[PDB]
Design a protein around this ligand. Structure first.
Ligand SMILES: CCNc1ncnc2c1ncn2[C@@H]1O[C@H](/C=C/CNC(=O)c2cc(-c3ccc(F)cc3)cc(O)c2O)[C@@H](O)[C@H]1O
Ligand SMILES: [Cl-]
Ligand SMILES: [Mg+2]
Ligand code: NA
Length: 213
């Protein structure tokens, strides 16, 4: 098997079906005690939770599901009727994520879109009946944060107040994205210093609130 399969099996055997918090705890324990994996983790996850609670978004887009950690983390805090769309290009990881969400009992709140964001983003309005997004969590390949932010804007998916929340702005880093949003009048930015998942290494989240064109 793969590391991702081992994480899923650990959750299934060490969390309670339908209990998202127990699922997060199991992933975090496994990744701390057994094998590191690129989940946002609990340190930055607490910041994510605070942001989700503040904004209570009705429609969230996640770029880069991986094993479904952040999809579980966010969806557990969504209000009734709210939804999360999460894009994942790797079929094996998309299957992990779906099974993770199913175990957590969150499958009715989340849609997996098994594809690349640059192909799927232009289909959101006509195929996924999206008007505009309330929040976007960026956690895919770091050199795609800027291209996909510009594409979301082009496609009319951003509105005044849409919250972009970007992982890994320190490690591995996303220098072009960060310089761009911080320098642009179209985004009001805040930096949340934290730690790399499971490691005593500084990382951070960037919140960039879209202000209109
Ligand atoms: C092609 C762009 N569009 C995409 N659309 C949909 N899914 C995509 C896309 N890119 C990547 N994916 C998926 O997102 C995930 C990839 C995320 C990339 N993340 C990282 O590189 C990352 C890396 C680290 C890290 C930090 C320190 C290290 F020493 C080593 C690694 C930490 C993190 O928190 C990370 O998020 C995978 O599941 C992948 O298949
Ligand atoms: Cl952590
Ligand atoms: Mg990350
Ligand atoms: Na700015």
């Amino acid at each position: 098997d793969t590391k991702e399969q081992r994480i899923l099996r650990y959750v299934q055997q060490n969390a309670k079906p339908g209990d998202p918090q127990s699922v997060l705890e199991a992933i975090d324990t496994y990744c701390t005690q057994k094998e590191w994996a690129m989940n946002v983790g609990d340190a930055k996850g607490q910041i994510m939770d605070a942001v989700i609670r503040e904004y209570s978004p009705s429609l969230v887009l996640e770029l880069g599901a991986y094993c479904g950690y952040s999809a579980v983390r966010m969806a557990r805090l969504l209000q009734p009727g709210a939804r999360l769309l999460t894009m994942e290009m790797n079929p094996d990881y998309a299957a992990i994520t779906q099974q993770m969400l199913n175990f957590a009992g969150l499958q009715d709140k989340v849609t997996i879109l098994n594809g690349a964001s640059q192909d799927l983003i232009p289909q959101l309005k006509k195929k996924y009946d999206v008007d505009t997004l309330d929040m976007v969590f960026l956690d895919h390949w770091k050199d795609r944060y800027l291209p996909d932010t510009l594409l979301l804007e082009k496609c009319g998916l951003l509105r005044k107040g849409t919250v972009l929340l970007a992982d890994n702005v320190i490690v591995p880093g996303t220098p072009d994205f960060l310089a761009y949003v911080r320098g642009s009048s179209s985004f009001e930015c805040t930096h949340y210093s934290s730690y790399l998942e499971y490691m005593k290494v500084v990382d951070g989240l960037e919140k960039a609130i879209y202000q209109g064109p």
